[PDB]
Design brief:
One of its GO terms (molecular function) is aspartic-type endopeptidase activity. By secondary structure, this protein is mainly β. It is built from six helices and 26 strands. The protein has a six-stranded mixed β-barrel with strand order 2-3-8-4-7-6. The longest helix is centred in the middle third of the chain and has 14 residues. Bound molecules: ligand 4B2.
Length: 388
């Protein structure tokens, strides 16, 4: 019901990530750690870097254990290399428990750390199947549940400000909540609707229908989940498979056609700006994603506003309100990233192999429209939407 100790324990923003304070080692070393449901390694800066103000010093921890094994983790953009070990870990604004967890001590990296993000490591909250070097490296959350009485569930409320924050404002500001071991009813309005976790590797789900202002995108539903659809707090954008991206953008352009925007805007590259307070939210469509429900032949929908998919950014000069388009293409399936998660309180119910969605008590909206979670809808042949 109520988890006051964990409410408001996140800071950050969609563009650079949301992070939680953790301590590692004995005596405790404090570090800020990116909350990432799209990966499964707990990995921390452990050597000086131009963008790190502090790092894990294994030689100062009496409880550090060396696993004598290296790990190399390349991504499409960026990479890091490190040394595997274990140590005692706590989350100060979390459950009052201390656990021994695997930690990859990052000793070298390229384009991984972000200048001014304020985080020094990543907490991969997904499953062992996608851990590096292999699935025998138990992820943090699995350790936490095995070693303590914490229920096998966590929930995330990511709070977008609706306007830009500089590095000073992000430091002073509450970015949201990670509730470990429960669901806090103050963080949402309306009902929670649950979709099954298709397979425990990423948090994989199945999308069964997409609408732009109520108009069906009318693609074969397999296209929406090609080659998977995941919920990922460590990706900024809503990312869509190439063909779905092309269809969706064509439809969003048609809905907003009273104003013409440059190709670079739709490509996610360039900002657009309006005079202060005059952003024409009403010309942009709402986007609905229908998700497989828990009951046979039942779906539900989550609906976001342009206040979610237009990401506020600071002007290159002004008092203008400026934004980038935060929907982009993917060659690795749909990614429901931070700009989608900012609409919703998201419950990662690992114990019951399901993900819940409710309207966020902190989502950005206007006097005419709000984000929504609605159901049920009768939907047939939903398993056929999943890609094999
Ligand atoms: C681990 C990874 C990831 C995320 C962010 C990151 C997080 N939030 C915002 N911007 C960047 C980052 F800065 C570095 C990363 F390696 C791989 C790319 S996708 C993902 N889910 N996690």
């Amino acid at each position: 019901g109520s988890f006051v100790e964990m409410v408001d324990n996140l800071r950050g923003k969609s563009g650079q990530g949301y992070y939680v304070e953790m301590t590692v080692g004995s005596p405790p070393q404090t570090l800020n750690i990116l909350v990432d449901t799209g990966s499964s390694n707990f990995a921390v800066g452990a050597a000086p870097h131009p963008f790190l103000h502090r790092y894990y010093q294994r030689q100062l921890s009496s409880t550090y254990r060396d696993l004598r094994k290296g790990v190399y983790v390349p991504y499409t953009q960026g990479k890091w290399e490190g040394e595997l070990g274990t140590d005692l870990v706590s989350i100060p604004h979390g459950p009052n428990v201390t656990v021994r967890a695997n930690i990859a001590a990052i000793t070298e990296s390229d384009k991984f750390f972000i200048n001014g993000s304020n985080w020094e490591g990543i907490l991969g909250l997904a499953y062992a199947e996608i851990a590096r070097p292999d699935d025998s490296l138990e992820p943090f959350f699995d350790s936490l549940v095995k070693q303590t009485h914490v229920p096998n569930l966590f929930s995330l409320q990511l709070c977008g400000a609706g306007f830009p924050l500089n590095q000073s404002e992000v430091l002073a500001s509450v970015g949201g909540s990670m509730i470990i071991g429960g669901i806090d009813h103050s963080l949402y309005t309306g009902s929670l609707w649950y979709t099954p976790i298709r397979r425990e590797w990423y948090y994989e789900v199945i999308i069964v229908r997409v609408e732009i202002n109520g108009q069906d995108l009318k693609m074969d539903c397999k296209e929406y989940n090609y080659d998977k659809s995941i919920v990922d707090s460590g990706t900024t954008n809503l990312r869509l498979p190439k063909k779905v991206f092309e269809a969706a953008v064509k439809s969003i352009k048609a809905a907003s056609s009273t104003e013409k925007f440059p190709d670079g805007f739709w490509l996610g590259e360039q900002l657009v700006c309006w005079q202060a307070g005059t952003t024409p939210w009403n010309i942009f469509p709402v986007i609905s994603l229908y998700l497989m429900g828990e009951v046979t032949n039942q779906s539900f929908r989550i609906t976001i506003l342009p206040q979610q998919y237009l990401r506020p950014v600071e002007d290159v000069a002004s008092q203008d309100d400026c934004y980038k388009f935060a929907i982009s293409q993917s060659s690795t399936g749909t990614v429901m990233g931070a700009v989608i998660m900012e609409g919703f309180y998201v419950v990662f119910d690992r114990a019951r192999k399901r993900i819940g969605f409710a309207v966020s008590a902190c989502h950005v909206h206007d006097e005419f429209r709000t984000a929504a979670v609605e159901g049920p809808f009768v939907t047939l042949d939903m398993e056929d939407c999943g890609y094999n």
